[PDB]
Design a protein around this ligand. Structure first.
Ligand SMILES: C#CCO[C@@H]1[C@@H](C)[C@H](OC(=O)NCCCCCNC(=N)NC(=O)NC)[C@@H](C)C(=O)O[C@H](CC)[C@@](C)(O)[C@@H]2OC(C)(C)O[C@H]([C@@H]2C)[C@H](C)C[C@@]1(C)O
Ligand SMILES: C#CCO[C@@H]1[C@@H](C)[C@H](OC(=O)NCCCCCNC(=N)NC(=O)NC)[C@@H](C)C(=O)O[C@H](CC)[C@@](C)(O)[C@@H]2OC(C)(C)O[C@H]([C@@H]2C)[C@H](C)C[C@@]1(C)O
Length: 498
């Protein structure tokens, strides 16, 4: 019954704000007016991005911003709510550029969560900005707080939540209450920075938006899909860092949760969240990319998948060889490594030498250019069927994407997502989810339902034996066990009754 959330980022550069116009593509490619009423109805949230934290340790616009043109841009987004009484215009603080470990504003993020008084100032600033510009909610995109800072982050969010709840009451907004989200890690290396405290991080949120994309890139040895739903056994696998997180668990508990190596997939990140107690599936939102990542230098045989490559990882792009054939936007943006889906459609339609290919394990498409050795990972409306089905089966909160500007002119990607969740006549009950590798991990938050004979006192149980006792199905870790399940270290909680 509950509508799935559909959360799209709206990004716009300061200079485009400062020269805002709806009538010249060359200055603003993606003005607000491109978000039609139909698109507005298909969205539950728009995340206006990006604001930052300044050296005053407050939430702030880029100090180069024209305040009047900014309010005006924001007012145009809030005006969209006239077409959709569920729609919220959030704003996001952070992003990669401002907030990564070597990002320009990084110390501000660290310092703003550091002390109770810093947090009180920061939290106040966030809600002050929300109220002052007419936003509906706050999204923090810090990529990423690191173990010492995690406690502060958690307290900062708790403090923002309280203040948002005050505001909701002040404005009689119980029908559309002010909301708080974060953009969360979508792979285990970064996730591990705050995994042990995942329940505390999620508890103040309406949603945690998993950045389950960019899981592959020019920083890798080997080309791969950036947003594989499930694993392909032919592709690379990675070390599971979560098994070194400070969890306090036993060896068997770690082993059952954190297989290693493992396939770095949408399904993995999702399950890694669900294995944690107190992380409810309804709060977990699957992120998807509206952009492809391109590699060159690929020597193929398998469509350019899982090949070595020569794609530079340096930022900015280190020369003017714009080798992504047919990508006009790459030229404008001086970087051939990222193409919007809009662009990718034109590349594929034109006479440029690409084949669209499909990996039936990952359920994701990819472009291959056999003549030049190019590979592109991206998502389309076919891969979204499988993902939307996954979102329904696993009872997730919804879907998030980066970003709106990269949908095609008709908004076919957004339309596809809306359709798979909400169209009466769309049926995915026969859609085959394939035999690609699932993430098997089991943890306290996602115990399966099981049966077994009652535990009996006096019986000697061999290794592997399953009994039921006091709610749960337990399994001996070795033999021969006579102790009651749960009372010493010999029994492993493996499932739940009922
Ligand atoms: C998001 C993101 C990455 O920031 C980009 C930026 C870094 C671009 O990278 C990019 O687009 N990558 C696509 C992959 C996305 C997947 C990763 N997603 C995330 N990590 N987070 C996420 O999804 N959060 C919800 C890059 C190509 C660029 O233009 O940099 C230019 C210089 C070339 C810039 C640094 O000057 C940049 O200029 C403009 C174009 C004005 O954009 C400014 C920033 C100052 C933004 C602050 C940075 C912003 C948004 O363009
Ligand atoms: C290596 C290398 C050179 O640069 C590295 C960096 C580029 C890493 O490359 C690397 O290890 N390459 C060797 C082969 C992959 C094998 C494992 N593979 C993985 N761990 N894969 C994975 O997690 N996939 C999502 C890369 C994994 C990364 O984290 O990029 C992030 C963006 C996602 C980054 C570019 O923002 C990066 O983030 C952090 C981690 C904060 O580090 C910053 C830099 C800003 C350093 C400047 C770059 C420094 C040193 O981490």
């Amino acid at each position: 019954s509950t509508r799935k959330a559909v959360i799209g980022y709206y990004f716009i550069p300061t200079n485009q704000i400062n020269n805002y116009t709806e009538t010249d593509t060359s200055v603003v490619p993606f003005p607000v007016s491109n978000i039609t009423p139909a698109k507005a109805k298909q969205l539950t949230h728009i995340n206006f991005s990006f604001l930052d934290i300044n050296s005053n340790l407050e939430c702030a616009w880029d100090p180069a911003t024209n305040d009047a043109k900014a309010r005006d841009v924001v007012n145009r987004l809030t005006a969209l709510k006239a077409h959709n009484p569920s729609l919220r215009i959030m704003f996001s603080i952070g992003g990669w550029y401002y907030s990564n470990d070597l990002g320009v504003s990084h110390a501000n993020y660290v310092n703003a969560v550091k002390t109770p008084a810093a947090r009180t100032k920061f939290a106040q600033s966030c809600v002050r900005i929300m109220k002052d510009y007419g936003f509906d909610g706050v999204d923090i995109d810090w990529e990423y707080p690191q173990a010492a800072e995690v406690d502060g982050f958690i307290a900062a969010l708790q403090e923002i939540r309280t203040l948002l709840n005050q505001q909701t009451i002040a404005d009689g907004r119980q029908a559309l209450p002010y909301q708080l989200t974060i953009a969360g890690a979508g792979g285990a290396f970064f996730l591990s920075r705050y995994y042990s405290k995942l329940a505390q991080i999620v508890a103040p949120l309406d949603y945690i938006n998993l950045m389950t994309y960019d899981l592959a890139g020019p920083w890798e040895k080997i080309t791969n899909h950036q947003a594989a739903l499930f694993g392909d056994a032919a592709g690379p696998t990675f070390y599971n860092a979560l098994r070194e997180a400070n969890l306090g668990w036993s060896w068997e508990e770690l082993t059952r949760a954190f297989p290693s190596p493992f396939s770095l997939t949408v399904d993995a990140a999702v399950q890694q969240h669900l294995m944690m107690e107190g992380v409810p599936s309804a709060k977990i939102v699957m992120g998807v990319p509206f952009y492809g990542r391109a590699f060159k230098g690929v020597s193929g045989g398998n469509g350019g998948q899982y090949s070595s490559h020569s794609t530079p990882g340096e930022d900015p792009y280190p020369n003017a060889d714009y080798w992504l054939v047919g990508c006009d936007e790459c030229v404008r943006d001086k970087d051939p490594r990222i193409a919007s889906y809009r662009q990718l459609e034109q590349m594929l339609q034109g006479n440029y030498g690409y084949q669209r290919l499909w990996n039936d394990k990952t359920k994701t498409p990819y472009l291959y250019h056999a003549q030049n050795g190019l590979f592109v990972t991206y998502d389309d409306a076919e891969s979204f069927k499988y993902k939307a089905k996954y979102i329904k089966q696993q009872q997730l909160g919804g879907v998030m994407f980066w970003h709106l500007g990269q949908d095609n002119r008709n908004g076919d990607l957004l339309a596809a997502l809306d359709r798979y969740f909400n169209a009466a006549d769309y049926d995915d009950s026969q859609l085959d989810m394939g035999t690609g590798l699932r993430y098997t991990g089991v943890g306290p938050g996602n115990l399966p339902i099981m049966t077994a004979p009652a535990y009996v006192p006096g019986t000697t149980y061999a290794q592997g034996a399953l009994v039921s006792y006091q709610g749960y199905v337990w399994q001996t870790k070795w033999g021969y066990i006579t102790s009651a399940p749960g009372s010493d270290s010999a029994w492993l909680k493996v499932g739940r009754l009922a």
